[PDB]
Amino acid sequence: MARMHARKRGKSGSKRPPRTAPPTWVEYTAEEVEGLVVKLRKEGYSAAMIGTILRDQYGIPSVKLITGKKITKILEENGLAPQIPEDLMALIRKAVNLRKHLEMHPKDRHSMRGLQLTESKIRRLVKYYRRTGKLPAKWRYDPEQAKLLVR
Amino acid sequence: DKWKMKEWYVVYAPDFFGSKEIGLTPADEPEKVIGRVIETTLRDLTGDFTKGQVKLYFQIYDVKGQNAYTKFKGHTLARSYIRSLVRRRTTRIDGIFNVTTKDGYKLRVMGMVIAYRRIQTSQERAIREIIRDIIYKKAEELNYRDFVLEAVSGKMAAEIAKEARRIYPIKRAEIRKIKVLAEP
Amino acid sequence: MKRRPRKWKKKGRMRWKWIKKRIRRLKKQRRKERGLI
Amino acid sequence: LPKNLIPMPKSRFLRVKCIDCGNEQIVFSNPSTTVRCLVCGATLVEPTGGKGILKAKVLEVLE
Amino acid sequence: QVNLKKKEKWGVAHIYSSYNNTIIHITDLTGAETVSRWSGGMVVKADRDEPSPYAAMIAARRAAEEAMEKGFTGVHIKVRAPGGSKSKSPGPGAQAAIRALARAGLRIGRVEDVTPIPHDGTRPKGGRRGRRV
RNA sequence: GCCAGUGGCGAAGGCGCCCGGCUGGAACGGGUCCGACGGUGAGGGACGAAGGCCAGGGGAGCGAACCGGAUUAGAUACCCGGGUAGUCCUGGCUGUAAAGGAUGCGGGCUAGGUGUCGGGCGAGCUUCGAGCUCGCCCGGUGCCGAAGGGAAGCCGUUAAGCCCG
Ligand SMILES: [Mg+2]
Ligand SMILES: [Mg+2]
Ligand SMILES: [Zn+2]
């Protein structure tokens, strides 16, 4: 899914099997699963990393299957969900680090293009999240404000 | 200048090669043969034809009288041998390293290995690291003399073929060149 | 310029590079006698 | 009907026990993180580009 | 006058061979004292004939007999086609000259194509399209 | 340089000595997260070979212009000898190319075979090697090819086929 700026037909990904009900081999209930989610967010892990750890260590496939809820739903219930969304945050951190690189390296135009594409993605997601309310309407990407944000 | 005022100034190799006569140069005013250089194909120790391709360059140092004694300047492998080595569907991994021996001789060592097949750049640089590590430790633990002897021999190349067979199988590693830079 | 591969062919033509160069010389003369002389 | 209809995982969840504590623990065969025993901190599977390399499963199951 | 038991005096014949001339040049084992240097253009008067294996053998014979007069029972061979941006093939004069030396009777030792090959390349002549002759 | 390839990376232009540092993007694996956020894009912007220009440096080789030697009926050329700008660096402008896959981008369908690069899986072998061989999956890059298409050449699951934009 290099699509969107590279147009390679990559198919790497997950293959969730159709599951109307949770697996019987699973030990944990919805409640303790939620507790683990909250524990790991306090340990400082993003939701993606939380699902990864619960898949690899605790053998939990699809917190959604188990609890009926999503990880970010659990986080916002326990008052721990991130202020701005994670994917946007990640892009912004990338862009800031790259801004720094490019100030010390002005002739790296290929990395400059990578920055341009990164900020394009940012703008797209900002548009969508303004439209859906996950950001204020007046929110807008800016490099310096984003630097303060990350920091 | 006529050629009859010339005296033949027999030329001897260094000590650690066995101070054999490696030839004789004509000259007058023996200051004229100081910087001169002789190349020989390890016919110093020609009890082996395994090494007819190893050209050793010595340089006259301190002629005494009708006896010109030399120093080791470097060695190279013969272009014939190298062009036999480097083929297609075959990989060439060279490494050029500056090393100070235990006794302060500075050398540039251009070693090389030949992997059987077309391999990855990461493997190539792993082997380059192997070469670097072997050469560096040999240099810091050995002196100029036995180092050079190893290298004009093949103990080092053999260690390198071994200790790099673990990255990829190897076909006839070598050391390919040494040149001296300094001799404190 | 806008160019034409058709013009680049040579079946009944002069070479396009040189046609082009002629055109540009003419244009230069015209520009020259237009603005200042 | 085969191999693209209902694309199904090749990976498996599998039950292992550590050699040190012996606690049975479910894990994933293709982990992105080094999996540690919940009791001892021992690595049960070390991550790779694909199927993780398994330590400490001498009594094993797979679901 | 060192007491020479062997009379196996060895020199070096540097043979510059090209498509326009050939130069035999015999020296001591070092290469810093010259003993014979003969060219196609010495041995003939036609420029077009300078490169030929004919007149290469003659230059080789004269240089050989001069050297084996002066001692020098044997010669190593270093044949040299022109430089890096120029041609890298010697010519016929090379093999012709070594055959001539063997005929003259000098013990031919080890031979080597000592041709300077570049690992980079300066720009060669002719321009982008070469010699359109 | 040889290695160096219907090889690889890159939007294209383009990118080859090694080492270290900063950095971009992709593939694979993924019961990870978000939850349609997507496509195309008028206008608009960025990048953009060589060459050229401004300024400042450098200048080995090559070398437009020019200068000489030949050739020729002539020779404002081809050949030879030299040679200025330029080619290199710094910062800017220029914004053109047979910039070509002469093939806009996305998505679905329509036999495959055989290579090769990368990742993965499974087997076997091993000098137990980031190793070798076989097969399978994904993604790239090629050749061939039935049907099909086409004026034909040729294309042919990397369509120049059918459909959706
Ligand atoms: Mg057309
Ligand atoms: Mg065909
Ligand atoms: Zn344990």
Domains within chain A, CATH numbers bracketed: 27-81 (no CATH), 82-151 (1.10.287.10)
Rounded to whole angstroms, the Cα distance separating D14 from E27 reads 81
Rounded to whole angstroms, the Cα distance separating D30 from D39 reads 22
In what helix (H) or strand (E) does residue B109 lie, and over which residues does it extend? strand B106-115
Dihedral sign of CA atoms E82, E87, E90, E92 in order: negative
Q: What is the resolution of this structure in A?
A: 2.8
- The single residue listed with the structure tokens 């945050």 is A89
Dihedral sign of CA atoms B160, B162, B163, B167 in order: positive
| Cβ contact B44:B56 at 8 Å | yes
Indicate which technique resolved this structure: cryo-EM
Closest alpha carbon to B76 in B58, B62, B64: B58
Rounded to whole angstroms, the Cα distance separating B57 from B44 reads 12
How is residue B27 annotated by DSSP? Answer: B
Which stretches of B28-120 are DSSP H helices?
79-85
Rounded to whole angstroms, the Cα distance separating E73 from E62 reads 15
C27, HSE (Cβ side, Cα atoms, 13 Å): 7
CA of E55 to C1' of F66 (A): 41
A25:D7 CB<8 A: no
Which stretches of E7-107 are DSSP H helices?
40-43, 53-69, 93-104
Rounded to whole angstroms, the Cα distance separating B51 from B36 reads 24
Please state, as a whole number, how many other Cβ atoms lie within 10 Å of the Cβ of residue B64.
Answer: 8
- As ranges, strand F nucleotides with an atom below 7 A of a protein CB are 1-5, 10-13, 17-40, 46-48, 60-64, 78-81, 91-92, 96-98, 100, 102, 105-107, 117-122, 127-132, 137-140
Give how many domains chain B has, as a whole number.
Answer: 1
Q: What is the CATH number of the domain that holds E119?
A: 3.30.420.80
Rounded to whole angstroms, the Cα distance separating B41 from C27 reads 72
Closest alpha carbon to B150 in B141, B138, B164: B138
Domain containing B107 equals 4-184
How is residue A137 annotated by DSSP? Answer: T
Which residue type is seen at D47? P
Q: Scanning every residue of chain A, which has its alpha carbon at the shortest distance from the alpha carbon of D41?
A: A57
E113:B79 CB<8 A: yes
Which stretches of A44-150 are DSSP H helices?
47-56, 63-67, 71-77, 86-104, 109-132, 143-150
Which residue type is seen at D10? K
Nucleotide nearest to E85 (CA to C1'): F61
E29:B37 CB<8 A: no
The pair of three-digit structure tokens given for residue E129, joined into one six-digit string:
């399209």
Domain containing E86 equals 1-133
- Tell me the Ramachandran region of residue E19: left when phi exceeds 0, alpha when psi lies from -120 to 50, beta otherwise: alpha
| Cβ contact C3:C16 at 8 Å | yes
Give how many domains chain E has, as a whole number.
Answer: 1
- The single residue listed with the structure tokens 């031979």 is E111
The pair of three-digit structure tokens given for residue B36, joined into one six-digit string:
């001169």
The pair of three-digit structure tokens given for residue B133, joined into one six-digit string:
């590590």
Dihedral sign of CA atoms D54, D55, D58, D60 in order: negative
The pair of three-digit structure tokens given for residue B48, joined into one six-digit string:
């082996």
Q: At A57, is the secondary structure helix, strand, or coil?
A: coil
| Cβ contact A61:A26 at 8 Å | yes
Contact residues on chain A for D56, CB-CB shorter than 8 A: none
Rg of chain B's alpha carbons, rounded to an integer? Answer: 19
* Superfamily the domain D1-63 falls into: Ribosomal protein S27 (2.20.25.100)
- Taking CA atoms, C32 is separated from C28, C37, E66, in Å, by 6, 6, 76
Q: Where are the domains of chain D?
A: 1-63
Contact residues on chain A for D42, CB-CB shorter than 8 A: none
Which residue type is seen at B167? I
The protein residue nearest F119 (Cα–C1') is D49
Torsions phi, psi of E59, nearest 5? -60, -40
The pair of three-digit structure tokens given for residue B121, joined into one six-digit string:
């750049």
Torsions phi, psi of C26, nearest 5? -55, -50
Please state, as a whole number, how many other Cβ atoms lie within 10 Å of the Cβ of residue E7.
Answer: 7
